[PDB]
JSON list of C-alpha atoms in Angstrom, two decimals:
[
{"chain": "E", "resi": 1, "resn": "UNK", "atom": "CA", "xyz": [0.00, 0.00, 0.00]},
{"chain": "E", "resi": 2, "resn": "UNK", "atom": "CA", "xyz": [2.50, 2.32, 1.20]},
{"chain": "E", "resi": 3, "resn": "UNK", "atom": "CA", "xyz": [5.36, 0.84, -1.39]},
{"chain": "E", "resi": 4, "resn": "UNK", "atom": "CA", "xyz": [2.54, 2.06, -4.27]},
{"chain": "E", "resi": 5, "resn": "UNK", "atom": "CA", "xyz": [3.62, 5.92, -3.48]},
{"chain": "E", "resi": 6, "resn": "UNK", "atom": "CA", "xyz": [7.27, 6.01, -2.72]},
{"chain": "E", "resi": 7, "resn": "UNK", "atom": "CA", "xyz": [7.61, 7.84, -6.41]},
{"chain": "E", "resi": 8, "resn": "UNK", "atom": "CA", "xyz": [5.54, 10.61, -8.13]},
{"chain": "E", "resi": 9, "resn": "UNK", "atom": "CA", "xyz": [1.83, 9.18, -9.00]},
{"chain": "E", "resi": 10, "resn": "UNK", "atom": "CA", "xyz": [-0.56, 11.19, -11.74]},
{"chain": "E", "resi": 11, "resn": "UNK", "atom": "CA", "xyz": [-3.78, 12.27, -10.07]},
{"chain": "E", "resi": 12, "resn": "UNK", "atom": "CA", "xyz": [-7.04, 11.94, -12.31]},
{"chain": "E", "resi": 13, "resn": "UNK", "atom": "CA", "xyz": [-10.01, 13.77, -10.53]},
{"chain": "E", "resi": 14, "resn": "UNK", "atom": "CA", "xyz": [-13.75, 13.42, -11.71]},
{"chain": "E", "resi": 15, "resn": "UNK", "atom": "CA", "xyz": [-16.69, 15.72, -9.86]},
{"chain": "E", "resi": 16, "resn": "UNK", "atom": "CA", "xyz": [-20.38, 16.10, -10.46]},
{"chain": "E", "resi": 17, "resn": "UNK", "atom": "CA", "xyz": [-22.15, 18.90, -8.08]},
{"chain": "E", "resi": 18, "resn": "UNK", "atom": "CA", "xyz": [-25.34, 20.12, -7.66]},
{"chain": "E", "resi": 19, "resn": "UNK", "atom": "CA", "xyz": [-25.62, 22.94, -5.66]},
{"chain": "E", "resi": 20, "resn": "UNK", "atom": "CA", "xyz": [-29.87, 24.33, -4.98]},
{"chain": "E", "resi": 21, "resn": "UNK", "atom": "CA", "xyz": [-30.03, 22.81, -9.00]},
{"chain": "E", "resi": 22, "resn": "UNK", "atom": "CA", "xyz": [-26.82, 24.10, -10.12]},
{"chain": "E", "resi": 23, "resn": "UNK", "atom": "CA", "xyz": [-25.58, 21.73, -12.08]},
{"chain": "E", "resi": 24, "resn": "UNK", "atom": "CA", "xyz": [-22.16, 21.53, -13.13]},
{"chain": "E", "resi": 25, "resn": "UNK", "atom": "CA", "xyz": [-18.56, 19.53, -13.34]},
{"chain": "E", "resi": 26, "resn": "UNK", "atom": "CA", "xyz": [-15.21, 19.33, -12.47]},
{"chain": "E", "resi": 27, "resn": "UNK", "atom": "CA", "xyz": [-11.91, 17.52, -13.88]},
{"chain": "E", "resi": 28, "resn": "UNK", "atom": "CA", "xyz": [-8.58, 17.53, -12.44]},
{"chain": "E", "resi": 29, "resn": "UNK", "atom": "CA", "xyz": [-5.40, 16.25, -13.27]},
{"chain": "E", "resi": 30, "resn": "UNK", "atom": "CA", "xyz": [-1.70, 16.37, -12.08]},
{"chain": "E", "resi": 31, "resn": "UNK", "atom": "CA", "xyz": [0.73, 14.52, -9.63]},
{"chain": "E", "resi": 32, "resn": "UNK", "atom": "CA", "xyz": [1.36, 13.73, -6.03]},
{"chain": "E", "resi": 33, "resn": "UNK", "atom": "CA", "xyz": [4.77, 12.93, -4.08]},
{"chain": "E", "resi": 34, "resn": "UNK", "atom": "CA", "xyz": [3.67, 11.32, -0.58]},
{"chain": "E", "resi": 35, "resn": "UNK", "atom": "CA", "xyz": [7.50, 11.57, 0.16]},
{"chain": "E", "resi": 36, "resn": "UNK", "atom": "CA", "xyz": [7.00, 15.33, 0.29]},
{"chain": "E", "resi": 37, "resn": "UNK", "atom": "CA", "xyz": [3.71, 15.28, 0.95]},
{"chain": "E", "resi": 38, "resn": "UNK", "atom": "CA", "xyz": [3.52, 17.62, -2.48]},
{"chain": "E", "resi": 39, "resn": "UNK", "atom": "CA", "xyz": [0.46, 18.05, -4.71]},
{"chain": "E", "resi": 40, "resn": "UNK", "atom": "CA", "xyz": [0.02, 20.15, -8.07]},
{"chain": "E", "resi": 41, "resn": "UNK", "atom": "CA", "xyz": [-2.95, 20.10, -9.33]},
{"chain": "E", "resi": 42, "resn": "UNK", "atom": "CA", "xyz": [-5.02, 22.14, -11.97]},
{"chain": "E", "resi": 43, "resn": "UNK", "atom": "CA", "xyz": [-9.30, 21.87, -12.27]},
{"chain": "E", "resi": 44, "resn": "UNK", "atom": "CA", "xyz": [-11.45, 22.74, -14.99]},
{"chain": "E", "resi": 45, "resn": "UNK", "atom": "CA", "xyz": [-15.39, 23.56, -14.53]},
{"chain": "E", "resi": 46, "resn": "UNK", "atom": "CA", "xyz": [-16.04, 21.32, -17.83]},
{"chain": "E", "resi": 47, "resn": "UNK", "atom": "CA", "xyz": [-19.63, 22.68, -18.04]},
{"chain": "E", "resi": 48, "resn": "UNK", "atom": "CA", "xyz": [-18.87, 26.12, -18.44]},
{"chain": "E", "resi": 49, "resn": "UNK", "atom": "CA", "xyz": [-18.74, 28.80, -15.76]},
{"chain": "E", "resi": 50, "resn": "UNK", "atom": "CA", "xyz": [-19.06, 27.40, -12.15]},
{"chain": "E", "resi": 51, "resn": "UNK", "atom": "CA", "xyz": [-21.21, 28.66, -9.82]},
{"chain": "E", "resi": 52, "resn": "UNK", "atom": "CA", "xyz": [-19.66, 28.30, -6.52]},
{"chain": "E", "resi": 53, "resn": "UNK", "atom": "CA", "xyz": [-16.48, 29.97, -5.60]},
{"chain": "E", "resi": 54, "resn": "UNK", "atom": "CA", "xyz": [-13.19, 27.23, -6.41]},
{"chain": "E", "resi": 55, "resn": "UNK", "atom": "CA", "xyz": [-12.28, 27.75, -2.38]},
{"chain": "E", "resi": 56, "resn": "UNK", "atom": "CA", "xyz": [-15.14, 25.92, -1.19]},
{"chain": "E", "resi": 57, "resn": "UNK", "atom": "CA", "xyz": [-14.01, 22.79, -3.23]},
{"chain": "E", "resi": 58, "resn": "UNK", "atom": "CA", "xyz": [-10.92, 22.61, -2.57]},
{"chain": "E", "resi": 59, "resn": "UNK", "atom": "CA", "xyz": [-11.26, 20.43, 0.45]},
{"chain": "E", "resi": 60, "resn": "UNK", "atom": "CA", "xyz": [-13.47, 18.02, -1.48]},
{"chain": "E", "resi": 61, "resn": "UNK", "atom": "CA", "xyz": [-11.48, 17.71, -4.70]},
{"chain": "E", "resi": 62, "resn": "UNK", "atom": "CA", "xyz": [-6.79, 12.86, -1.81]},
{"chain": "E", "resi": 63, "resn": "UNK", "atom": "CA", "xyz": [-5.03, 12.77, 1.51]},
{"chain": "E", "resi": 64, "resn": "UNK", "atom": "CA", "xyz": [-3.44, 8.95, 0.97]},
{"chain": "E", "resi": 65, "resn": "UNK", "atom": "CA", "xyz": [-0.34, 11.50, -0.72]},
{"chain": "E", "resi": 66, "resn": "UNK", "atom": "CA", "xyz": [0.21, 12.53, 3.11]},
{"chain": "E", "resi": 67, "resn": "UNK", "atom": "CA", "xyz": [3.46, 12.88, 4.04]},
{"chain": "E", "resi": 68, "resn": "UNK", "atom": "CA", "xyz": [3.58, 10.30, 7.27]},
{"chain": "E", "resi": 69, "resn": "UNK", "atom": "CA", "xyz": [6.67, 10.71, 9.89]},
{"chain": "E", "resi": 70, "resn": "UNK", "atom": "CA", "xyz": [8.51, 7.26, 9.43]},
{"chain": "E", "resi": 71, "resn": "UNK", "atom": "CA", "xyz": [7.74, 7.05, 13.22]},
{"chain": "E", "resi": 72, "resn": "UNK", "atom": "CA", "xyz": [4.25, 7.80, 12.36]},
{"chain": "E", "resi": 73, "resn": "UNK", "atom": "CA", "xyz": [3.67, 5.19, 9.64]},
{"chain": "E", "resi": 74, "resn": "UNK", "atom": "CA", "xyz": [1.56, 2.74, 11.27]},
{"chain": "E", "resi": 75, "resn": "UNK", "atom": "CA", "xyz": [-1.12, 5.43, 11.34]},
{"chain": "E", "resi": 76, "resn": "UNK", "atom": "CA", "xyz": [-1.66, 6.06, 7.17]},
{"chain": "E", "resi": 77, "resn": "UNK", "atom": "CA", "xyz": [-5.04, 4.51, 7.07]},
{"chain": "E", "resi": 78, "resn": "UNK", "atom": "CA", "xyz": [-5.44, 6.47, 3.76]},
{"chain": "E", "resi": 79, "resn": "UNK", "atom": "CA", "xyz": [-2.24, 4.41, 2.17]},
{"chain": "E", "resi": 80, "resn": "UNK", "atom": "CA", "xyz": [-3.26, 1.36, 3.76]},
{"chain": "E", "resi": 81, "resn": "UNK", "atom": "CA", "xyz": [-6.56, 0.67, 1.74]},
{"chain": "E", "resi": 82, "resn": "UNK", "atom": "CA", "xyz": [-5.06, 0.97, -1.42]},
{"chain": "E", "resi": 83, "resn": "UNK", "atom": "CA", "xyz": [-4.62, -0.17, -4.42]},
{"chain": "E", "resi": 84, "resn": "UNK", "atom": "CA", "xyz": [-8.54, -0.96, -4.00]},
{"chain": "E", "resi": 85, "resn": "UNK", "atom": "CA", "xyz": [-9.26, 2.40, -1.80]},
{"chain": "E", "resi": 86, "resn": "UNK", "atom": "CA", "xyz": [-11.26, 4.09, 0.14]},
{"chain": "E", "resi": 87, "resn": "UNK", "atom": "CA", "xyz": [-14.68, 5.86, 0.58]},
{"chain": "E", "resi": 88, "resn": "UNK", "atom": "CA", "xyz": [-14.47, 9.61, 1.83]},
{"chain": "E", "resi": 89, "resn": "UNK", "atom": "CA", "xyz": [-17.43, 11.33, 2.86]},
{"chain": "E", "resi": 90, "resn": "UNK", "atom": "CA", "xyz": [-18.13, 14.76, 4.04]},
{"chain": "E", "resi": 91, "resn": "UNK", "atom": "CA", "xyz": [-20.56, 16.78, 5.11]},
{"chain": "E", "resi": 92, "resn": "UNK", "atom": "CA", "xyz": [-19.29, 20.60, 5.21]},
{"chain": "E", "resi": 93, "resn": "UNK", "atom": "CA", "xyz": [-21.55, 23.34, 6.85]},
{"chain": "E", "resi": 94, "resn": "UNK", "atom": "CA", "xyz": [-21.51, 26.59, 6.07]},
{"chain": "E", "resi": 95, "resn": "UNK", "atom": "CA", "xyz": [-22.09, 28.62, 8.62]},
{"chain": "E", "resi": 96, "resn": "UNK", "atom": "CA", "xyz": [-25.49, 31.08, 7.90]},
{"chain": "E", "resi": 97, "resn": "UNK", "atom": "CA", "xyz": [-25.41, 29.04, 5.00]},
{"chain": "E", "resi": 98, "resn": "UNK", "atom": "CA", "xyz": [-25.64, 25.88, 3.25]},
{"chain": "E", "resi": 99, "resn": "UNK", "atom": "CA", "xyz": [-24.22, 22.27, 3.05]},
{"chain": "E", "resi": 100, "resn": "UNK", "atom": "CA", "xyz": [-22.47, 20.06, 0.72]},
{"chain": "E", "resi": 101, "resn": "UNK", "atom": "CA", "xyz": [-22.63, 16.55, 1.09]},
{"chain": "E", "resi": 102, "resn": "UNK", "atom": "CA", "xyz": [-20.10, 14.28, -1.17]},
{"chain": "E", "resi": 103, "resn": "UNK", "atom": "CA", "xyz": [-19.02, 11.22, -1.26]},
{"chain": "E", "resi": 104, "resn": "UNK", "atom": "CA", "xyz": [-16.43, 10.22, -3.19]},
{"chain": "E", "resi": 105, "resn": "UNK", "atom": "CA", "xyz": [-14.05, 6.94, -3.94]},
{"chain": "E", "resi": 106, "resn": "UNK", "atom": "CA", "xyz": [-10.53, 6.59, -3.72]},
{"chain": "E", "resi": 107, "resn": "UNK", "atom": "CA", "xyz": [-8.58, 3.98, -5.24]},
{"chain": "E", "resi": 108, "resn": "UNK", "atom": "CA", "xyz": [-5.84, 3.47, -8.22]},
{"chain": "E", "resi": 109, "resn": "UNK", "atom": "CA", "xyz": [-6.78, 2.56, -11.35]},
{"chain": "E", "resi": 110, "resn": "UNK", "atom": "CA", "xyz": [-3.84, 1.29, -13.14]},
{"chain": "E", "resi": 111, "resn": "UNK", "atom": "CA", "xyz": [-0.99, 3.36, -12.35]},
{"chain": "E", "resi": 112, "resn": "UNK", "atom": "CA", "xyz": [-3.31, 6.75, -11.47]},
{"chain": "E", "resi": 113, "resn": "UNK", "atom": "CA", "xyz": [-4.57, 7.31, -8.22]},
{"chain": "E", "resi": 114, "resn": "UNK", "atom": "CA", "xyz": [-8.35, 8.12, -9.17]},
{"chain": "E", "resi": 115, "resn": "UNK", "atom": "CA", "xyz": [-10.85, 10.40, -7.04]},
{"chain": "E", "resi": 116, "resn": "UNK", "atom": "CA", "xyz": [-14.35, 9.85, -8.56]},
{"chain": "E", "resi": 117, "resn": "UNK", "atom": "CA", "xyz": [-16.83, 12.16, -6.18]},
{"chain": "E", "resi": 118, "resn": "UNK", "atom": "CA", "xyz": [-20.31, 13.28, -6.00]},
{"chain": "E", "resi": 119, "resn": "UNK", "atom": "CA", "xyz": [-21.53, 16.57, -4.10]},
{"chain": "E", "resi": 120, "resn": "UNK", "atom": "CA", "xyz": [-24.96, 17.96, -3.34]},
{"chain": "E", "resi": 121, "resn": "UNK", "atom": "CA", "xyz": [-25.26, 21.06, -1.73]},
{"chain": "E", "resi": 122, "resn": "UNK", "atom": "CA", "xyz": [-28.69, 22.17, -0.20]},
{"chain": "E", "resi": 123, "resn": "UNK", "atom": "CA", "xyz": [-30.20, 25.43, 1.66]},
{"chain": "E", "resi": 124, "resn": "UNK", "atom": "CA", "xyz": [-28.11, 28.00, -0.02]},
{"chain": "E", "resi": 125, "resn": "UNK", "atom": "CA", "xyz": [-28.67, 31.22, 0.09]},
{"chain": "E", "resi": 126, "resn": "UNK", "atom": "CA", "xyz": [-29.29, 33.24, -3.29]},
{"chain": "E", "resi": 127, "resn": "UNK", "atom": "CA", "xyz": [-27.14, 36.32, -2.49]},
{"chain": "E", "resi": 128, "resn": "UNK", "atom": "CA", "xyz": [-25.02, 34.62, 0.24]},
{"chain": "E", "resi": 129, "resn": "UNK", "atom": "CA", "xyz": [-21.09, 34.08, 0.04]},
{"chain": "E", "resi": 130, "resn": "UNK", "atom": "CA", "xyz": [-21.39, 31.06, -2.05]},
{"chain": "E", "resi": 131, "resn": "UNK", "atom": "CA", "xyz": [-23.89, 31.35, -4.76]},
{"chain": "E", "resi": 132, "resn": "UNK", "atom": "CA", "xyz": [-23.33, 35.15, -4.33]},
{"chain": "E", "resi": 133, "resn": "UNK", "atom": "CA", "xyz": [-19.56, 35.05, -5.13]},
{"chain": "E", "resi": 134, "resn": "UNK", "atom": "CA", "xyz": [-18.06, 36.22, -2.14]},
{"chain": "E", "resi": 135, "resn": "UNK", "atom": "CA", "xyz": [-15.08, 34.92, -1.44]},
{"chain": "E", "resi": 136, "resn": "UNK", "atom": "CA", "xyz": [-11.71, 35.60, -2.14]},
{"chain": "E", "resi": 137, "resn": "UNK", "atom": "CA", "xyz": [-9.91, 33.28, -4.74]},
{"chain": "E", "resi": 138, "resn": "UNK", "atom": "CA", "xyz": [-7.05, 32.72, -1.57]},
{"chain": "E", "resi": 139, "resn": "UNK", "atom": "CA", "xyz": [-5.51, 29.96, -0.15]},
{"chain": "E", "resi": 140, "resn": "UNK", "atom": "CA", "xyz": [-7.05, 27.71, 2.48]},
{"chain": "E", "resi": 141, "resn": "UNK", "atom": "CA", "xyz": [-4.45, 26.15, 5.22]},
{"chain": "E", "resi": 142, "resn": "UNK", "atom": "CA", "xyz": [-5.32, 24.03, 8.65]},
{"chain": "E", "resi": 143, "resn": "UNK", "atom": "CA", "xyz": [-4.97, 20.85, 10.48]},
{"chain": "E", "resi": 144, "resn": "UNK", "atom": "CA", "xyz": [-6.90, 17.92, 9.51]},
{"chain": "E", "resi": 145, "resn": "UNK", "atom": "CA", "xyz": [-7.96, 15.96, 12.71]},
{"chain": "E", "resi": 146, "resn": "UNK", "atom": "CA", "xyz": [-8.21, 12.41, 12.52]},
{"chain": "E", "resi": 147, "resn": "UNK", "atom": "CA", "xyz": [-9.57, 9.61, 14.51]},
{"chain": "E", "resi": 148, "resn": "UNK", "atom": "CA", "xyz": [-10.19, 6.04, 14.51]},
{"chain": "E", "resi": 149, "resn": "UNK", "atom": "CA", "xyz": [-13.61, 4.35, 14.08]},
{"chain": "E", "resi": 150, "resn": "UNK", "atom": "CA", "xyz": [-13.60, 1.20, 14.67]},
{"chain": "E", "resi": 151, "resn": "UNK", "atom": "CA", "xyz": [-17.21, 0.09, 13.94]},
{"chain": "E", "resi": 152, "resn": "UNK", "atom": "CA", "xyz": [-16.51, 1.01, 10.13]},
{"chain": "E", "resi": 153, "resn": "UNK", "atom": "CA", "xyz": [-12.88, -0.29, 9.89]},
{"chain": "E", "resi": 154, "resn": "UNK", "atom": "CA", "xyz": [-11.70, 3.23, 9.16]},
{"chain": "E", "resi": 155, "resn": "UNK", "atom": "CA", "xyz": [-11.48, 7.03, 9.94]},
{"chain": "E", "resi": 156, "resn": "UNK", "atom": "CA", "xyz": [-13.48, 10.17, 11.04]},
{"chain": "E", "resi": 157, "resn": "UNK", "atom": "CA", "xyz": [-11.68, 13.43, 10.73]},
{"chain": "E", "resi": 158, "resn": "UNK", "atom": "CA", "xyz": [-13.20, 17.04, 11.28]},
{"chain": "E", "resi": 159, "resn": "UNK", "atom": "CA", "xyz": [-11.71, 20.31, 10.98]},
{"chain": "E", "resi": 160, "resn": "UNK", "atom": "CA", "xyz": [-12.76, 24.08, 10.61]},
{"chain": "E", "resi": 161, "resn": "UNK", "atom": "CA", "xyz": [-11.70, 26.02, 6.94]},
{"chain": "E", "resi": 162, "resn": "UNK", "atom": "CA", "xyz": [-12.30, 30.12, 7.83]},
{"chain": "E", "resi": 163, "resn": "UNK", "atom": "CA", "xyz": [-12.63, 30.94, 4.03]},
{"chain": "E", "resi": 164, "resn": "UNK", "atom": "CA", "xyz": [-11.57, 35.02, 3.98]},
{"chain": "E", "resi": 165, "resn": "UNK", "atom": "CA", "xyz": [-14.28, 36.77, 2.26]},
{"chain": "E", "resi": 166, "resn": "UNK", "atom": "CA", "xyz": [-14.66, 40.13, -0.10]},
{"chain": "E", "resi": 167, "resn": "UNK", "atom": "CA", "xyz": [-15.13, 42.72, 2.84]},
{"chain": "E", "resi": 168, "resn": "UNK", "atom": "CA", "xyz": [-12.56, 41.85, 5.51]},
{"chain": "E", "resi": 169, "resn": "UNK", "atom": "CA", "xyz": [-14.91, 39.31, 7.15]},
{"chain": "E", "resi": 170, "resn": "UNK", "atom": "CA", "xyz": [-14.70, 35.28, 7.44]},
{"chain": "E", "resi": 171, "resn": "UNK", "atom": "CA", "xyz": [-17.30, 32.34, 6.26]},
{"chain": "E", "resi": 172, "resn": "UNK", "atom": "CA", "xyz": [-16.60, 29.15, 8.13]},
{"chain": "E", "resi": 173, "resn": "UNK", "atom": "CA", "xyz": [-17.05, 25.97, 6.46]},
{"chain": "E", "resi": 174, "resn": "UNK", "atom": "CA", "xyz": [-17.13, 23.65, 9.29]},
{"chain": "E", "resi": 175, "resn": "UNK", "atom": "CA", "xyz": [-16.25, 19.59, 7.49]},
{"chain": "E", "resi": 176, "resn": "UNK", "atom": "CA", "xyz": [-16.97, 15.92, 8.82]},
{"chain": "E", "resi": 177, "resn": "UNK", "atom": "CA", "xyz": [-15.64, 13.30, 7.18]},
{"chain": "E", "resi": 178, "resn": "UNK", "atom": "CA", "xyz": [-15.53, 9.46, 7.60]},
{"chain": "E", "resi": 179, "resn": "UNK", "atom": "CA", "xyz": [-13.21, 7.04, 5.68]},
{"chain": "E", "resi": 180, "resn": "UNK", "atom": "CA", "xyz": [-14.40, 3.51, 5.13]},
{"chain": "E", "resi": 181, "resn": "UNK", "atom": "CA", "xyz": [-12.23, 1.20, 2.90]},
{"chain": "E", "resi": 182, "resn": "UNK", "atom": "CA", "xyz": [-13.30, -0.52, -0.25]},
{"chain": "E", "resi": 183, "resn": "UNK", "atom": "CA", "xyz": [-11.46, -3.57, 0.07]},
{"chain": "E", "resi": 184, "resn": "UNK", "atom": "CA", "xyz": [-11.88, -6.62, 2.64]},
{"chain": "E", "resi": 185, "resn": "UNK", "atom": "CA", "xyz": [-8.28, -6.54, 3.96]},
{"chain": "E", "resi": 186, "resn": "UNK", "atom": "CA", "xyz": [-6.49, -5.27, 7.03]},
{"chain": "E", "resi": 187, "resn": "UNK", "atom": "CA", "xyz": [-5.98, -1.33, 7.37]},
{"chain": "E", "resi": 188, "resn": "UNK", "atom": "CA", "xyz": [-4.13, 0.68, 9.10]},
{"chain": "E", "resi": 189, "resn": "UNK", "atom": "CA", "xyz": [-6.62, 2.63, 12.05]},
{"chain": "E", "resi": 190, "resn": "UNK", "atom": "CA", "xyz": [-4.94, 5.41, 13.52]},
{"chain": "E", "resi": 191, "resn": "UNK", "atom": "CA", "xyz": [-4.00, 7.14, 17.39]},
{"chain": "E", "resi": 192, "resn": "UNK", "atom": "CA", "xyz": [-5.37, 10.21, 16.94]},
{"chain": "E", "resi": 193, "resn": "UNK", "atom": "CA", "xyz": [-3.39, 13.18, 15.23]},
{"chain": "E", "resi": 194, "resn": "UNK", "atom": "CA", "xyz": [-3.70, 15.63, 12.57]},
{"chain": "E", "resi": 195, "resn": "UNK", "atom": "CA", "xyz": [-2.84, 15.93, 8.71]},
{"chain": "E", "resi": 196, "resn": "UNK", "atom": "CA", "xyz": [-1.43, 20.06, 8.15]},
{"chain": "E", "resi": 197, "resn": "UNK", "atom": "CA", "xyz": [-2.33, 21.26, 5.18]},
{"chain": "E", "resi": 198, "resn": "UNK", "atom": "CA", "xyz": [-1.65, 23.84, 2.83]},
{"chain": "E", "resi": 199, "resn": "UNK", "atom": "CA", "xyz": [-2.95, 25.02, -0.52]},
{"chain": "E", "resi": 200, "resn": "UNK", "atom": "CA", "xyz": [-1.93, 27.64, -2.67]},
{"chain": "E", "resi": 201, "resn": "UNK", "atom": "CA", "xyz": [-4.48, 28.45, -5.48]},
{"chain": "E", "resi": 202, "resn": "UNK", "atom": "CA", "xyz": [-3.56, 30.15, -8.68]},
{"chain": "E", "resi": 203, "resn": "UNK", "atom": "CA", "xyz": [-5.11, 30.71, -12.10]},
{"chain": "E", "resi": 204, "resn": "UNK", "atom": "CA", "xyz": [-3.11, 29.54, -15.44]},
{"chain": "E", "resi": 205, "resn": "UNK", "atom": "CA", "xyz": [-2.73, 33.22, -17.41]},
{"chain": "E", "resi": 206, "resn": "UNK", "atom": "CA", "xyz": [-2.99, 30.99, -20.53]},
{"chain": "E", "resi": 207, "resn": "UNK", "atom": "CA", "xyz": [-6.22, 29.10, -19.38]},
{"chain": "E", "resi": 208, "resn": "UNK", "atom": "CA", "xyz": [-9.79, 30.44, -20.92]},
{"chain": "E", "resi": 209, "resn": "UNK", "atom": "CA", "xyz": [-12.42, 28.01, -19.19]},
{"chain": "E", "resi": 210, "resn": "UNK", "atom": "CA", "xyz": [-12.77, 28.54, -15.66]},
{"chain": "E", "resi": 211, "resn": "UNK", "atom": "CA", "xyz": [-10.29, 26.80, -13.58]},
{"chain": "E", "resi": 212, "resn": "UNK", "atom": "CA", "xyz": [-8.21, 26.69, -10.54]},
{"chain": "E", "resi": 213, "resn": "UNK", "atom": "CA", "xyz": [-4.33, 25.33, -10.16]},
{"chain": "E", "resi": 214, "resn": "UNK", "atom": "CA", "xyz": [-3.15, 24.05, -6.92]},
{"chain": "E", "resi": 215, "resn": "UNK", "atom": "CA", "xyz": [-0.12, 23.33, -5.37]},
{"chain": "E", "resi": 216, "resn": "UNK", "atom": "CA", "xyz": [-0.67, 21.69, -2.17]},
{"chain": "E", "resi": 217, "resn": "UNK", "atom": "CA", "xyz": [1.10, 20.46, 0.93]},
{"chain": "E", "resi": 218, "resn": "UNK", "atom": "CA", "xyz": [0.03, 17.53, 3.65]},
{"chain": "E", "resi": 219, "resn": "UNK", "atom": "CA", "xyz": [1.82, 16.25, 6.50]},
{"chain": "E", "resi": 220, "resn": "UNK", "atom": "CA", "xyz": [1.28, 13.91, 9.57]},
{"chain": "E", "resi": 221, "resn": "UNK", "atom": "CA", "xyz": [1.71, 15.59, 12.46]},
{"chain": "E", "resi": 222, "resn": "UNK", "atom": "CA", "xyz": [0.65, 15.27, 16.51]},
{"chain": "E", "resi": 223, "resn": "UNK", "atom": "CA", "xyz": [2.57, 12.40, 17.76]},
{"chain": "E", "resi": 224, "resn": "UNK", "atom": "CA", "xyz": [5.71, 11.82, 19.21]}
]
């Protein structure tokens, strides 16, 4: 499991949404480097213009490229489940706002570690920070905290994003996840600590459809 992402591993990623009936799509492709914990990544809305702000999906558009402590290694559920992956689930809340629920599945296909998700978001507002527009294309940056579950054979994690919006002021998107592997055989479930992450967004000045580019870093932390 862990052997599968000692090198540099392409990244396909595949999103449907629907946000209050707002249909739309996402692909992404790049590369990940678990031994730096590095991501680059760059998104395209594939239906045309999307209609939430990029920020808010950042969290939901592959934490198996991790960077674990070697004394921390025998808590990388995420590496663990593969080749055959995992589930990840969220539900994110945004506070005086709406929700997204997504589900997505995690597991290599060939030689490309694949992230196939779903998201429905519900109870919007109109002329909120989301639908409305908001928020400011920046980066997003925080710890990840993980802990075991034992009844599903796998994780539950939540943390807090404080997306900065237009006038000065902050929209929390407060997340829940739960990982459940796909496969029958043993995984790795974790003392509790935290992933840190960091994500630097950026636009490509020679890109036309609406996009994001992403260069991302994840590490194990909280045990020593």
């Amino acid at each position: 499991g862990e052997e599968l992402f000692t090198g540099v591993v392409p990244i396909l990623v595949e999103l449907d949404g629907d946000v209050n009936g707002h249909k739309f799509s996402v692909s992404g492709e790049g590369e990940g480097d678990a031994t730096y914990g590095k991501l680059t990544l760059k998104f395209i809305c594939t239906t045309g213009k999307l209609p939430v702000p990029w920020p808010t999906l950042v969290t939901t558009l592959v934490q198996c490229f991790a960077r674990y402590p070697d004394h921390m290694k025998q808590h990388d559920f995420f590496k663990s489940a593969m080749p055959e992956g995992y589930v990840q689930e969220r539900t994110i809340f945004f506070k005086d706002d709406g929700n997204y629920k997504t589900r997505a599945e995690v597991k290599f296909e060939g030689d490309t570690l694949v992230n196939r998700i779903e998201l429905k978001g519900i109870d919007f507002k109109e002329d909120g920070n989301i639908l409305g527009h908001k928020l400011e294309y920046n980066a997003i940056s925080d710890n990840v905290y993980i802990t075991a579950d034992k009844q599903k054979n796998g994780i539950k994690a939540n943390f807090k994003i404080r997306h900065n919006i237009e006038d000065g002021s902050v929209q929390l998107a407060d997340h829940y996840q739960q990982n459940t592997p796909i496969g029958d055989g043993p995984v790795l479930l974790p003392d509790n600590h935290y992933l840190s992450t960091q994500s630097a967004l950026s636009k490509d000045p020679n890109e036309k459809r609406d996009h994001m580019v992403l260069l991302e870093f994840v590490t194990a932390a909280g045990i020593t």
